[PDB]
């Protein structure tokens, strides 16, 4: 999110990849013909001249370019039956170093692009990367885990927040929905209470949580038009149910 809200709020070709190698560039260019042929078609307004803009779109990428490599740890040593994990991390060096990729628009330099690699690094660690990359990735930023109170916020304050999204998606039905504060806790604390007892997918947990919540309303919003129902403590509760640890033990443990 922090890397995506750095492309629309700074205007520059973006592209996320999950570890061909140059296709990371060839595609960074195919996502630039939208801030040059959508910003100079409504700004500079025919005007065709591809041969003219085959160095107006690249002058953009060559400089304004953001590459995102999600889950990189997955390519670190430890790994003897597949040294190819260090191969990718190697064929991806020319790009962070500086080369010339041949796209279907012309030759695009990279030296000045901007790379952002994400990683959980629970298994391996920074130093478990080829020396080359360790020195061509000088910025080490440490994020933190989302807490109980952190879901209570991410649930509203942010633009396009879930509360907002379901509010508007349910208004277009002729219905109004109230998300009380004493009930945002029991929706953010009930999304955390789930990550500490199974996979901690983070925020995405919220999505799955709401979907279960609006499972009763999203279906019968038609046959119940023009109503204002309050979603509070007692409602959120008798909405989903109870989540407890499988039984793990009692199965394969003596």
């Amino acid at each position: 999110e922090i890397a995506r809200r750095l492309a629309k709020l700074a205007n520059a070709p973006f592209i996320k990849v999950e570890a061909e190698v140059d296709s990371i560039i060839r595609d960074l260019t195919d996502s630039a013909m939208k801030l040059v042929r959508q910003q100079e078609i409504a700004k500079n307004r025919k005007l065709i001249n591809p041969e003219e803009l085959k160095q107006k779109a690249i002058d953009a990428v060559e400089q304004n370019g953001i590459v995102f490599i999600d889950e990189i740890d997955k390519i670190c040593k430890k790994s003897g039956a597949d040294v190819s994990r260090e191969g990718v991390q190697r064929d991806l060096l020319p790009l962070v170093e500086g080369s010339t990729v041949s796209t279907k628009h012309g030759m695009v330099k990279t030296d000045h692009i901007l790379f952002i690699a994400s990683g959980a690094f629970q298994v391996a660690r920074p130093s478990d990367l080829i020396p080359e990359l360790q020195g061509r990735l000088p910025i080490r930023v440490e994020l933190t885990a989302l807490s109980a109170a952190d879901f209570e916020r991410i649930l509203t304050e942010p633009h396009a927040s879930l509360t907002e999204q379901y509010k508007a998606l349910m208004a277009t039905e002729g219905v109004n929905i109230a998300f009380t504060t004493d009930a945002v806790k029991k929706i953010a604390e009930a999304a955390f209470r789930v990550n500490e007892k199974t996979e901690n997918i983070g925020a995405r947990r919220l999505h799955t949580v709401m979907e279960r919540l609006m499972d009763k309303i999203s279906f019968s919003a038609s046959d119940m038009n023009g109503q204002t129902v309050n979603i509070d403590a007692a409602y959120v509760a008798d909405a989903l149910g109870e989540v407890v640890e499988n039984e793990d033990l009692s199965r394969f443990i003596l």
Binding site: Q122, V123, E196, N200, D248, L249, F252, I253, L254
Partner: protein
Amino acid sequence: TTIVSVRRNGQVVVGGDGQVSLGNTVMKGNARKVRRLYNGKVLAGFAGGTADAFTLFELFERKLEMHQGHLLKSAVELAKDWRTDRALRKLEAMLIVADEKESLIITGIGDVVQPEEDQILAIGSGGNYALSAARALVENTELSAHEIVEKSLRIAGDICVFTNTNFTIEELP
């Protein structure tokens, strides 16, 4: 080696000696047989072959970091690695792991074991000795899970020719 663990009064302790015995000689008598895992969330005591001890200790660390420190599970996930079509060798050693909630014992053969009502745990050569001592204590005295685990180790070191009095004990919290 003698690793014992007693849990009483919201207290969990895991002690073990420090005699690295080789054959019938002593290579070192101060080693740490109980280490801390997950920045200090779980206690681990190993007993077995110096090598296979760690190969199974460090092998349970992975399953921990890869599972948000969910002990009771991470253990099982480790076990399952031996219960397949393609096994993981076999490890001459056993592990005693416990955190603020649970306490277990994992063998390098691939199996997990839960304590009994008294949840006391012991592994290694001088096992049952320290165990008999613990049980003896835990059942007839109001002693700290630490004091017991300490006291029980001694009894054992004084009987097992492969266990010393120089031990290291870790408790939670």
